[PDB]
Design a protein around this ligand. Structure first.
Ligand SMILES: *[C@@H]1O[C@H](CO)[C@@H](O)[C@H](O)[C@H]1NC(C)=O
Lengths: 196, 39
């Protein structure tokens, strides 16, 4: 009874980060060493847990949060980070517990002439709370003049698109992120690694 | 205060994207975020 991580990692379309995608994982076993030792990952930061004893442990619930960001911003998908992504698009809590995994998807999500399927939120009247998802599209009032719901002067559409092009530098090229949350709360614990 | 400057900075990156310079449009985006946090 295997945990379906291919649907998360090996999936076709990823979400824009402002509308990140969340998959619940319960009632299964999961060879994590497959993930760690498929070694296709420019990042594999884990917190409150060791990425080698993952097979040994079990958890109540697992969530798998996934999305695309450029490579610079991957540093922000870690507890405690500030910045345009961790502020306005996807925030991790101080007490995070889980892993964060990213790989370069220049082949997939870059297009000649710019790939605009991927947006981020640039404006937001305040920082995101942890795991808060704000898929709002209201016009952002930056100055003292009402926006009446239309873009204009200090009245900006809050989503800006990435311009993914294969000819970008490595920092501007799209990365696919998968953040796994290991929920250890008071419950039987239904998700277990390859070893008890 | 900054009411005018912001608009003009926003307009830059919008124009740059239109002209193709995507990395530069994105580096201005970054700076608009930092500019609006700076109190
Ligand atoms: C995704 O597919 C590759 C090979 O196509 C495989 O090595 C990898 O383990 C798969 N991902 C998961 C989570 O099983």
């Amino acid at each position: 009874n295997l945990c379906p991580f291919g649907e998360v990692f090996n999936a076709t379309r990823f979400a824009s980060v402002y509308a990140w995608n969340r998959k619940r994982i319960s009632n299964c076993v999961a060879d994590y060493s497959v993930l760690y030792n498929s070694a296709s990952f420019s990042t594999f930061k884990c917190y409150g847990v060791s990425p080698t004893k993952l097979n040994d442990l079990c958890f109540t619930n697992v969530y798998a949060d996934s999305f695309v960001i450029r490579g610079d911003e991957v540093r922000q998908i870690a507890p405690g980070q500030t910045g345009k992504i961790a502020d306005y698009n996807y925030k991790l809590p101080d007490d995070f517990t889980g892993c964060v995994i990213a790989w370069n998807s220049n082949n997939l999500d870059s297009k000649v002439g710019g790939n605009y399927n991927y947006l981020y939120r640039l404006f937001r009247k305040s920082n995101l709370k942890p795991f808060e998802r704000d898929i709002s599209t209201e016009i952002y009032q930056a100055g003292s003049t009402p926006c009446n719901g239309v873009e204009g002067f200090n009245c900006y559409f809050p989503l800006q698109s990435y311009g993914f092009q294969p000819t970008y530098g490595v920092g501007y090229q799209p990365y696919r992120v998968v953040v796994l949350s290991f929920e250890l709360l008071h419950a039987p614990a239904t998700v277990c690694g390859s070893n008890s | 205060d900054k009411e005018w400057i912001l608009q003009k900075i926003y307009e830059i990156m919008r124009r740059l994207d239109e002209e193709g310079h995507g990395e530069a449009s994105l580096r201005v985006s970054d700076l608009i975020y930092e500019f609006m946090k700076k109190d």
